[PDB]
């Protein structure tokens, strides 16, 4: 049964709730972004409207095969009427095509649903600036003060350096990057750009990337592995036994892999900086963890919530245990008392 934090009061609207069957009263199903925990349930056999971004729409048509008529894409930053309810989609700074949604209720209440988001000061000069938001459905993935991590630009710096160093020291080394969903494309696109290469990938990953409206994408990616010295592999596969296995397949064309595992937070964020990172080394294969996040740090979330001064906050992540729920409420009370809303 669909949980209350996936429903919008005073509408027939649900958000990211495609896994419960028909939800009684729901005229419209919103999908914030193409990540399987949020889309779990969609197929070619959906014949209810789905509202989403253009980019999410392309992924729905081409990867799950939903029929063009039931995909209502909407432009961002555009006041749009949807069953006689004004809504806006705003960029979430998550993965490609990921959105937050502003709902303007008839009764005068305004609600923001963040979907998954990495809060940023550029949001404070968006359409949110123009009016009061009463309710906030919030991505609470990293709602605890241990959760710090660097800026994406810091991380992309490190990567561009590591890769370009090794490639120049040894010109027969391959760069690999791990992936399992959309997101974090900047990692591999930045490395490939510094090395004068395209990125090489399986057919299915090429298909996924050809849906994202990246400008110039035909110049940046290929399915021809032989022709490329930055390769993408499944994240499952980014280990020694799998990198060894893969290093065979290239057929004596490279004598050393240098891989990157973009991850979110791990416990080594508590005791080590980004300029002071190392990889595990079994022979000639070197695997980097790099903490590239597409979710708000604790401080980033805090600033956004304290600027927004919402009258009420409804968590959408880590809501399954009473301890997590309770811990989160305590932070929301501190923020409000500090900020005087
Ligand atoms: Ni996500």
Q: How far is the CA of 186 from the centre of ligand 1 (A)?
A: 16
The pocket of ion ligand 1, defined by CB under 5 A, consists of 35, 116
Tokens of 270: 């508590």
For residues 278 and 90, what is the distance between their CA atoms, to the nearest angstrom?
A: 37
Tokens of 73: 């894409």
In 3D space, the residue among 39, 34, 12, 33 whose CA is nearest the CA of residue 23 turns out to be 12
Q: Is the dihedral of CA 77, 80, 82, 85 positive or negative?
A: positive
For residues 329 and 143, what is the distance between their CA atoms, to the nearest angstrom?
A: 10
Q: How far is the CA of 50 from the centre of ligand 1 (A)?
A: 18
- First-to-final CA distance of the chain: 34
Backbone phi and psi for residue 199, each to the nearest 5 degrees, phi listed first? -95, 140
Q: Enumerate residues 6+ apart whose C-beta is below 8 A from 192.
A: 175, 198, 199, 220, 228, 230
Tokens of 318: 């880590």
In 3D space, the residue among 80, 97, 111, 89 whose CA is nearest the CA of residue 10 turns out to be 111
Q: How far is the CA of 263 from the centre of ligand 1 (A)?
A: 13
DSSP SS3 for 232: strand
The DSSP secondary-structure symbol of 64 reads I
Q: How far is the CA of 332 from the centre of ligand 1 (A)?
A: 22
DSSP SS3 for 67: coil
Total Cβ atoms within 10 A of residue 150? 18
For residues 322 and 147, what is the distance between their CA atoms, to the nearest angstrom?
A: 20
Total Cβ atoms within 10 A of residue 147? 20
The DSSP secondary-structure symbol of 249 reads H
Q: How far is the CA of 315 from the centre of ligand 1 (A)?
A: 15
For residues 131 and 242, what is the distance between their CA atoms, to the nearest angstrom?
A: 52
Residues 307, 122: contact at Cβ < 8 Å? no
For residues 156 and 292, what is the distance between their CA atoms, to the nearest angstrom?
A: 8
CA angle 251, 254, 258 (to 5 degrees): 130
For residues 295 and 83, what is the distance between their CA atoms, to the nearest angstrom?
A: 31
Q: How far is the CA of 165 from the centre of ligand 1 (A)?
A: 32
Q: How far is the CA of 133 from the centre of ligand 1 (A)?
A: 23
DSSP SS3 for 324: helix
Q: How far is the CA of 38 from the centre of ligand 1 (A)?
A: 7
- From-to residues of CATH 3.60.15.10 in the chain: 1-147+296-341
For residues 57 and 49, what is the distance between their CA atoms, to the nearest angstrom?
A: 12
Q: How far is the CA of 196 from the centre of ligand 1 (A)?
A: 31
Tokens of 322: 């009473």
Superfamily of domain 1-147+296-341: Ribonuclease Z/Hydroxyacylglutathione hydrolase-like (3.60.15.10)
Q: How far is the CA of 33 from the centre of ligand 1 (A)?
A: 7
For residues 217 and 226, what is the distance between their CA atoms, to the nearest angstrom?
A: 19
Residues 18, 40: contact at Cβ < 8 Å? yes
Q: How far is the CA of 95 from the centre of ligand 1 (A)?
A: 7
The DSSP secondary-structure symbol of 63 reads I
Place of tokens 């789905």: 50
Q: Enumerate residues 6+ apart whose C-beta is below 8 A from 4.
A: none
Backbone phi and psi for residue 71, each to the nearest 5 degrees, phi listed first? -95, 105
Place of tokens 């290093």: 247
Sheet (strand 99-104) strand order: 80-81, 86-91, 99-104, 110-113, 135-138, 312-315
Q: How far is the CA of 116 from the centre of ligand 1 (A)?
A: 5
DSSP SS3 for 44: coil
Total Cβ atoms within 10 A of residue 50? 20
Q: How far is the CA of 323 from the centre of ligand 1 (A)?
A: 23
Q: Enumerate residues 6+ apart whose C-beta is below 8 A from 281.
A: none
Q: How far is the CA of 169 from the centre of ligand 1 (A)?
A: 37
For residues 185 and 187, what is the distance between their CA atoms, to the nearest angstrom?
A: 5
- From-to residues of CATH 3.40.50.12650 in the chain: 148-295
Q: How far is the CA of 171 from the centre of ligand 1 (A)?
A: 36
For residues 11 and 337, what is the distance between their CA atoms, to the nearest angstrom?
A: 32
Residues 307, 280: contact at Cβ < 8 Å? no
Q: How far is the CA of 98 from the centre of ligand 1 (A)?
A: 8
Backbone phi and psi for residue 193, each to the nearest 5 degrees, phi listed first? -55, -45
In 3D space, the residue among 187, 109, 113, 108 whose CA is nearest the CA of residue 152 turns out to be 187
In 3D space, the residue among 314, 331, 338 whose CA is nearest the CA of residue 138 turns out to be 314
Residues 327, 144: contact at Cβ < 8 Å? yes
Total length of the chain:
341
For residues 35 and 37, what is the distance between their CA atoms, to the nearest angstrom?
A: 6
Q: Enumerate residues 6+ apart whose C-beta is below 8 A from 115.
A: 15, 16, 32, 33, 38, 92, 94, 98, 99, 100, 101, 139
Q: How far is the CA of 87 from the centre of ligand 1 (A)?
A: 21
Q: What is the CATH number of domain 148-295?
A: 3.40.50.12650
């Amino acid at each position: 049964t669909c949980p209350f934090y996936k429903k919008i009061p005073g509408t027939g609207f649900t958000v990211d709730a495609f896994q419960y069957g028909v939800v009684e009263g729901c005229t419209a199903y919103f999908l914030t972004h193409f990540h399987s925990d949020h889309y779990a349930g969609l197929s070619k056999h959906f014949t209810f409207p789905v509202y989403c971004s253009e980019i999410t729409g392309n992924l729905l048509k081409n990867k799950l095969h939903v029929q063009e008529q039931y995909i209502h894409p909407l432009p961002l930053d555009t006041e749009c009427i949807v069953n006689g309810v004004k809504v806006v989609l705003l960029d979430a700074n998550h993965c490609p095509g990921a959105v937050m949604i502003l709902f303007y209720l008839p009764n005068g209440t305004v609600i923001l649903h963040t979907g998954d988001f990495r809060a940023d000061p550029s949001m404070e000069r968006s359409l949110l600036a123009d009016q009061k938001v009463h309710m906030l459905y919030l991505d609470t993935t990293y709602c605890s003060p241990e959760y710090t991590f660097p800026s994406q630009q810091e991380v992309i710096r490190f990567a561009i350096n590591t890769a370009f160093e090794a490639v120049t020291l040894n010109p027969h080394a391959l760069v690999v990057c791990g992936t399992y969903s959309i997101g974090k494309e900047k990692v591999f696109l930045a490395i490939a750009d510094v090395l004068g290469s395209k990125v090489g990938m399986s057919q299915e990953k090429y298909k996924t990337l050809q849906c994202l409206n990246i400008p110039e994408i035909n110049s940046l990616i290929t399915t021809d592995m032989c022709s490329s010295l930055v390769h993408l592999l499944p994240m499952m596969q980014i280990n020694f036994k799998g990198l060894q296995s893969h290093l065979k397949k290239c057929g004596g064309k490279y004598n050393q892999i240098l891989a990157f595992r973009p991850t979110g937070w791990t416990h080594s964020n508590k005791f080590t900086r980004i300029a002071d990172v190392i990889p595990q080394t079994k022979g000639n294969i070197s695997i980097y963890g790099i903490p590239y996040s597409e979710h708000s740090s604790y401080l980033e979330m805090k600033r956004f919530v304290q600027w927004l001064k919402p009258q009420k906050i409804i968590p959408t992540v880590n809501v399954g245990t009473w301890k997590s729920r309770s811990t989160m409420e305590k932070y929301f009370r501190e923020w409000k008392l500090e900020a005087g809303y």
